[PDB]
């Protein structure tokens, strides 16, 4: 199952969408990601790609960086993996 | 058209699983050094480009430090990634 936020993100190029457009990234996570430099969704894509799309390492990185719980990191990972399947 | 044909081929389409050597500026010598550091597909170098917020100075320095790229190689790689992003990101 997926959210509309997920479907909206995976349907099109992300351009300069803010980090909060990613599935799983709410206002609280988004704030903390922004304070650490990850202010646009593509910067988080960048980390996903630097980590060679590794689910365990990306989701652990997200937890360590902004405090994402397991559902939030699942949602964020899945939306980036599906976006990459469609556009990369 | 100022760019290389290799730039043109790269920016014309999604990169998928293309190797790092498909990037403009990344010949076989630079490509093997990138692979040895774990940057084995073009998308991993895109990742670093994006994590650095597409900043030219930081990206070109990173490339120099990571594989010894000269100024022309680093400008070509940066420009190829920048135009790819403008087309597809």
- Give CB contacts under 8 A, 24+ apart, made by A74-78: A74/A24, A75/A3, A75/A6, A75/A22, A75/A23, A75/A24, A76/A22, A76/A23, A76/A24, A76/A25, A76/A44, A77/A48, A78/A2, A78/A6, A78/A23
Q: Print the domain residue range for A24.
A: 1-88
Could you say which of A13, A37, A50 has the minimum Cβ distance to residue B88? A13
The Cα A21–Cα B63 span in angstroms is 30
How was this one solved? X-ray
The Cα A66–Cα B54 span in angstroms is 22
Distance from CA of A45 to the nearest CA of B (A): 7
∠ Cα A26 A81 B34 (to 5°): 115
CA B78 to chain centre: 6
> A40: helix, coil or strand?
strand
Q: Say if the Cβ atoms of B50 and A37 lie within 8 Å.
A: no
∠ Cα A39 A50 B84 (to 5°): 75
β-bridge partners, A18: A40
**Which chain A residues contact residue B85 at CB under 8 A?**
42
β-bridge partners, B41: B19
Report the number of distinct structural domains present in chain B: 1
Q: Give me the helix-helix angle, B42-51 and B56-67, nearest 10°.
A: 130
> B82: helix, coil or strand?
helix
Resolution (A): 1.7
The Cα A51–Cα A65 span in angstroms is 14
Q: Say if the Cβ atoms of B43 and A49 lie within 8 Å.
A: yes
CA distances from A57 to A50, A66, B17 (A): 11, 14, 20
């Amino acid at each position: 199952t997926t959210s509309q936020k997920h479907r909206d993100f995976v349907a099109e190029p992300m351009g300069e969408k803010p980090v909060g457009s990613l599935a799983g990234i709410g206002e609280v996570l988004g704030k903390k990601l922004e304070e650490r430099g990850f202010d646009k969704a593509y910067v988080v894509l960048g980390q996903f790609l630097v980590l060679k799309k590794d689910e365990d390492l990306f989701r652990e990185w997200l937890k360590d960086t902004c405090g994402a719980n397991a559902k939030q990191s699942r949602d964020c990972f899945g939306c980036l993996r599906e976006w990459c399947d469609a556009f990369l």
